[PDB]
Structures are given as structure tokens and as C-alpha cells.
Amino acid sequence: ASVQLQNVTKAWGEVVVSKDINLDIHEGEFVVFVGPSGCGKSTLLRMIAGLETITSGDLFIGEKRMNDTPPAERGVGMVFQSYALYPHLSVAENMSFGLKLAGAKKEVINQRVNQVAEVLQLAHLLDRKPKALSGGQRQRVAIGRTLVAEPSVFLLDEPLSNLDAALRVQMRIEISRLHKRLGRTMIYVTHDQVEAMTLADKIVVLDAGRVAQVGKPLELYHYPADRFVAGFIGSPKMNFLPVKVTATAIDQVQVELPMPNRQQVWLPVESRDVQVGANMSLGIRPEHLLPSDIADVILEGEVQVVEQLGNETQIHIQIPSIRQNLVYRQNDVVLVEEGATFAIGLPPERCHLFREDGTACRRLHKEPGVASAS
Amino acid sequence: ASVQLQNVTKAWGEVVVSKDINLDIHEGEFVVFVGPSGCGKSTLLRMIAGLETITSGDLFIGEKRMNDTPPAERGVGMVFQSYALEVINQRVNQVAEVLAIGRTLVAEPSVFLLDEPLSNLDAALRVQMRIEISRLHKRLGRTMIYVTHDQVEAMTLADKIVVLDAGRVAQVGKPLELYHYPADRFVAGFIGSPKMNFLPVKVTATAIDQVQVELPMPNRQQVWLPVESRDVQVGANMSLGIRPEHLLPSDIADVILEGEVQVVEQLGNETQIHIQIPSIRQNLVYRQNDVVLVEEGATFAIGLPPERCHLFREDGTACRRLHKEPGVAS
Ligand SMILES: Nc1ncnc2c1ncn2[C@@H]1O[C@H](COP(=O)(O)OP(=O)(O)O)[C@@H](O)[C@H]1O
Ligand SMILES: Nc1ncnc2c1ncn2[C@@H]1O[C@H](COP(=O)(O)OP(=O)(O)O)[C@@H](O)[C@H]1O
Ligand SMILES: [Mg+2]
């Protein structure tokens, strides 16, 4: 319980894969590390587990330094993608395996195995051998071993990637109810943002080894710190329009839309380090675009793609005011054929603004679900 | 080249993986076979391509019988996860325009077969890649049969979707027909992001094009649902289906269902709420756009929209909904 990373760094030769990670994981917290493949998610969990050495920095688990502690003496349990079960043990044996080495009454053993067995949809396979199960079933068995063991700290490296879409959904639900009941510290890694939003108490976004941002789900969604975070968090990606600053004021920045459309708009974002003439990036999420019974800033274009998902419609629009096609989301079924002329509004209070260095001008509009000043 | 299956069946001893499969795939149609792992998706693809044999029934790649024809002569190209990377230059520079998959396109196969191509790619990459596949099909109208376990890809890519359930065709139709008018509980629970809610109900009346059921609450309120009454007998026990996105806010009321909040998931673009209605087991899942601020344990009320409810018989078959939904012909 309780994990602290103080300037933890990792490097292979002259390549740095983990750069000065600073994290304070509180006891019982559910922390998700997210980012694309190659950003250093597994290397980080492996350093916590003691399966990789820490180049520099200190790692604390339960207040004690663990840099030099052997894997099995750190109080952690780890599960990962396509875990290999012991071929000669029965499902039940593979699930109680961790708890047995750690010593424990058979009473506690069977109690947990049975419980975890139900939760993970495996109570009927208890007596079979792993060779007789599906890839989805073995993975669940692997997850179960650690859940039965109940280590002081759970480390899960993309544990659900081996499951059908439907099973991932149910497993996420089960992982959540398990964390609530056990209250144990859990560090979970995924490349999937939806999963991070759903499971995490707090999320840490990794970008090629660096911590881009750490915060609650909504803190990342409403107030991303840079373009990377803004475009990583949010099912269908945030729209980005290249803009040019034309004026600045107290807690306010004005920009001009690109290409032909040269319309100027005021955005309620901090002017801190913004300078007239700066080429910047304007961000607006598909779900945040308005339907246009006049919003005072309108973009009109030609439908390129239309996705009917039943619960909602995702329209791809080509704006004559030239760029990349403006994705729009609206609830329920929206009737429009791929070719029509669709017009949507652009709400200033919902716009994000990124400098050339990618950093963001702090939005000042107050969003629900995130602690705000005043 | 259109593909067609006539009572196709496959069996490995006493195990039948394909049960009387009847499929009509028109040329230049984007078809997706969806279903859980083990349902027979790969077996079908391989029978069409000839890498496996058809136990009974007939396979037509356009107009012909490929049942007994070597693979290298059916003219069907396949693709899996990742790749083993005057005319040759004109076709390549040509296929390079509409756009690996391209090597297959350049071979100009009669039908394009894809077996879970987005399988092991990052989530965000899967999203980009399918937008890509759709574009590739928009510009190049060849015949494509895509196989996956993920309902999202099916709803997003296919012109026509075929849901497979343990070797049998549960249903065939466009994305919105399957979403709006699922034929059975299996299809109703498979297609759709967070799963459709199912409530055990007991019928207490019928009529022409209309069935009345009572809800499991100590309120046992009775409601009229616009579904065909063909095979409904008063007093019968059935399952009432209602999607999370289709439940009503409150404000509109009209049917209420109130309970205690169990779980709240803030996803930014929407809020998913799990409510425990003091009556039934299994929390009810509710979805509402944007951010909803409710604590766990708080009381929350929602509404049931009659014309949006599905009704299933004890055998899982659905009572064809009659409410007209925009997007589907009939
Ligand atoms: N033993 C190693 N030697 C050199 N580079 C490594 C080693 N292990 C991982 N890496 C580098 O780190 C990245 C992948 O591991 P991480 O553990 O970063 O994976 P991911 O975040 O995709 O799960 C790549 O940039 C890879 O080259
Ligand atoms: N050669 C084979 N012998 C016996 N059973 C097979 C064979 N190939 C596939 N199956 C059966 O078919 C199912 C998996 O293949 P399908 O080809 O059904 O896969 P999926 O739909 O998961 O892609 C399992 O029920 C499996 O036992
Ligand atoms: Mg990894």
C-alpha cells in the first residue's frame, strides 16, 4: 500500500524510456497509466515490481525504499497480457497459487477462489486444465490468481487486451467493484483512454517516457495541459484548427480562424504567455460543437462520412474554410446523407488553445465535476 | 463478385460449427460477421476461401460453385493482423491513390476477406484504422467480408451485419435494423455499447399491435407497449428490454423508476449511472450526455419510454416493435 516514485528514471544505453517520474500513489488509490505503445508503461510497472532496475531516483512502497528489494519481497502482485498459466495445474490450482506461497489457511483459500471464480465467470471450469480453456478464459484465470492473492499492491499491465470487446466491458465493471470492496492500492496500465476514464481515481498520461499530466478523469478531459493530452483523452479525437492570435486582454485571448474564413473570436483563456501574431492551435471536441440555430460563430461544410451508431451520429464535415474535417457528434439518429451541406456552431467557452510548444492556455470557463476557484 | 451461401453447414465429427448458413452477399457490399470468439467467424471465412471444406450446402462466388475448387483459383484475397512486408506500375500507383492491404488490393481479388485486422493495435490506432477502411471502401467498391468480435467495428464499418451465435445466424441486416429491431435477446444484448437493460415482466393484456405488461416493482405499474401481439398470452413471463441511452431524464417523467445510485462513471462526453431500483436485481444502467453530478447512494429517478421498450418471449424471440424509428425503412 502507498507507492512513491521520486525522480525515477530509466535508460537503456543512451536511450531514456522513463524520465524523472514523480508520483505519490496514496494508499488504496486506483491509478491508471495511459499512453500509446512505446511510452514506457510496462517498463514503469516492471520497475515497481523489481523486474527491471531503476537507473536513478527512488522508489518507495509502504514508506520503505525498494530499489534493491527482490520482486517477491515487495508486497506486489502482477498480472499482464497473455499470461502463461502452469500447464499441469487445474484452474483452481492456478488461482490459489499465489496465496499458497504466501502461506494461508485452506479455509481462506477456497473462500476466495470460489468468490473470485463467480465474479470472473469461471466457477464451472474450476477442475479443468488450462489446455482445455479459451484464450479469454486463461487470461481471466491469470487475473484471478492475483485477485485471490490480494497483494498490498496490484500491478496490472493491459490485463484485458486478450478478451472479446463484450468481456472487456464486463471485466472493467468487475475490476471496479473489486477495488471498492478490497480498498487495495492498484496501478493499472492501458493504451485505451476509455478504460482509464472508467476505472481510475487518478490518471497519469505518459508521452514517450515523460509524465504529460496527472489528474482526475474530468480534470484531464476539461483542462488538458497540452495538445498531447487533449488529443489522447476523448473517445473520438478533439478537433484542432490552426489559428493566429490577433489580440489579448486580461484572462482573454482573441484569434482568427484559418484560411479563407478569417473570422475573429474571443476565447476565455489565460493570456499568460501569449503574444499577438502567435500561430496557435484551437481545440474543440466533437461533442462540444453546437447545432447552429445561430451560435455567433458558424462553420458550414460538406459531409464526407456519416457513422450511425444508434445511440449517436458522428458526422465528418469538410469546411470550405479548408481544413481536415471537423468531426461532429449528436445524440440519437441524425438524418443526413454523405454529401449534404452541414453547418455547426463553435462555442468559445468550450474551446481550448495550445501554443506552438504544445502547452495550453488554461481555460477559465468553469466546468462541472472539477473543483474550481471562487 | 457477389458471394452466396446456401444451407452451408460445417461439421467436425459430432460438432457442427456452421448451422444451415444462408447468406446473400451482393457485389461491392461491405459485410461484417460479428459474434463472440468461438462462434464460427473464422471457419466461415476459410470455407469461402477454400482453406476449409463445406460439409453440405452450396457456395457461390458470383455465379459458380466453388465448393470443390482449389483456393488459388477462387480469386479471394485475405488479410490478418499486420503483414509480412507498365501494368505493375499503373495498378500500384492506382491502388496507392484510393488508399499491406494494398498488396491484396493490387491483386484485385473477386472478394476481399479480412479476419480481425485491427486485432492487436492500440485503441486510438483501431479508431483511425477503421475510418481508413471505410474510406477505402467508399472509393473502391469491391466486395468485402470482415470478421470481428467487437460490435463497435460492425456498427461502424458494415453495409450489412451478420450476427453469429454459436454457429447459427441470429440476424442479418443493416446496422440500424439490428440496433432498432433486434430479432432476439441475443442480438439485443450484443449490439449496443453499454448493454441493453433487461427487466422481468408479466403480461396482463393484449390487443391488435399492442401488449400490456406489469413491472416488478412493488408498484407493479402496468404499461402498454407498441409491439406485435401475435404470440403473446396473458400472464406469460417475459423480458422487457430498454437501452441505457433511451431511458428518460426525469423532468419528462411519464413512467417513473426511482432507486439508489450504485456507480457513477464520468466519461466527460457523457455520464453513466448504475441504479438499484428497490424491486429488481441487477442495477439499471443509465446514460446521459455531458456531466451529471450525482453521488453514490443518492436517490435518482428516471423514466421508461414505452415506444422504446423491446419485449422478449421466454424463448428469447422478440415481439417485433411497431414504433417507427428514423433511419430504418420498415
Ligand atoms: N530491454 C530493453 N532494452 C532497450 N530498450 C527497451 C528495453 N525494454 C524496453 N525498451 C524500450 O522501451 C519501449 C517499450 O517498453 P515500455 O516498456 O516503454 O512499453 P509500452 O509503454 O509500450 O508498454 C520502447 O521504446 C523500447 O525500445
Ligand atoms: N479443426 C477443427 N477441429 C475441431 N473444432 C474446430 C476446428 N476448427 C474450429 N473448431 C471449432 O470452432 C470454434 C472456433 O472457430 P471459429 O472458426 O468458430 O472461430 P471464431 O468464430 O472464434 O473466429 C470452436 O468451437 C472450435 O472447437
Ligand atoms: Mg506494454
Ligand SMILES: [Mg+2]
Ligand atoms: Mg476467428
